[PDB]
Amino acid sequence: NTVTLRADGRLFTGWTSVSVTRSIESVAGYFELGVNVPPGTDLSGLAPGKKFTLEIGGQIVCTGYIDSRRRQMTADSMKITVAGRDKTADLIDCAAVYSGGQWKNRTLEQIARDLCAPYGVTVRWELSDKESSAAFPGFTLDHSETVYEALVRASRARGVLMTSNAAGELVFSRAASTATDELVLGENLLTLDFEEDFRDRFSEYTVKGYARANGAEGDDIDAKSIVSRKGTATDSDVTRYRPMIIIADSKITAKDAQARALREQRRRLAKSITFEAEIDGWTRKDGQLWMPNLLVTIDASKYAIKTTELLVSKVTLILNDQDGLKTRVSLAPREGFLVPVESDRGGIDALVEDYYRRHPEKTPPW
Amino acid sequence: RVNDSALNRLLTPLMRRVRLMLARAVVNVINDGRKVQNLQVGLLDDEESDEVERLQNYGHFSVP
């Protein structure tokens, strides 16, 4: 279980301290290693801009480019580190470049594939929804906007969440369905932390915006319905009044408004309740590493906790000397990372779609 | 949001939207078939915008 950093040319195996991070609430997974060498040796394989591939054991965790390298030495100590992110983090700080700033009738996957072409990032679309693939009647790009900003703006309206794969690709992820692992307070937990704060969760999220009137719809739409648009999503966990009004982000319809309102309600639900645990082993029970987007069964019933299933949201692996092998796994409810079409557990079309939604491994009719 | 560059990254998009709200443009194509004139304008640089509606007061009309 050695952490090998495939840099440009050769392998690097031994390390003094390793820290890797992965999450689905982010578009990259950053790593930081500590290297210790005699003063005067050549450290050029670890330089900013080199193409790195981190490999834990025989499996690749991150791939991309090296960002920073710190070297310090005092009268009684010496410390050298190195850092980096994915190749998907190349989009975060780079400005989106396209010829015609407007896409007339395109879907989110096609927009992303046209935007991530010059860099090298490959886009991956996992959702099998019929409404998440609905094409944009028109989508324009603000000038000097990063690819990350544009794709996040589109994915927020679609309800999809954008993430980075373990091989450097872009991913429009799908939440897990089958409970795979178990975390109990008695057997395999060193430390738990259960925070439950209600300072942000509201009752009724309602979104208001402007209708579509640019061109073809301008010969049909009237004057009042251009300005009068609305969407609502109600929560049953807050029993007081507690409303919220959201100004839309782009041109809006009723169904689009309802989708964003839920998107917001589910994100608030995910951000409210948080579980944190420190397990002893990097590897899982089966043997693979711990990664986000996994549905685990929590049995912290000796501490009077009544949650039964959660979804991992953040995994950070540590190799400090004082720590040993640890991985701090953070947990959030699954119902916070779903698309507005699906729900947590009127015709033949509805029945067939239900069947093919309950069974995702089957091929839809499309 | 402790570093100068981190604060710059956090605060840039708001100023970008502020600076991009109002703009100038040139007119290349005018379509009058619709109930509202649809221009095809050209923004700062290497940026086009098709089907941009023009608003004119009631009682006056003109085709540039």
Binding site: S26, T88, I92, V152, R156, M162 | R1, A6, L14
Partner: peptide, 17 residues
């Protein structure tokens, strides 16, 4: 720097705007 690193990394949930 827990929040100072979440800015340099992506954030599919927008902080502002």
């Amino acid at each position: 720097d827990g929040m100072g690193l979440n800015i340099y990394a992506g954030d599919n949930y927008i902080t502002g705007w």
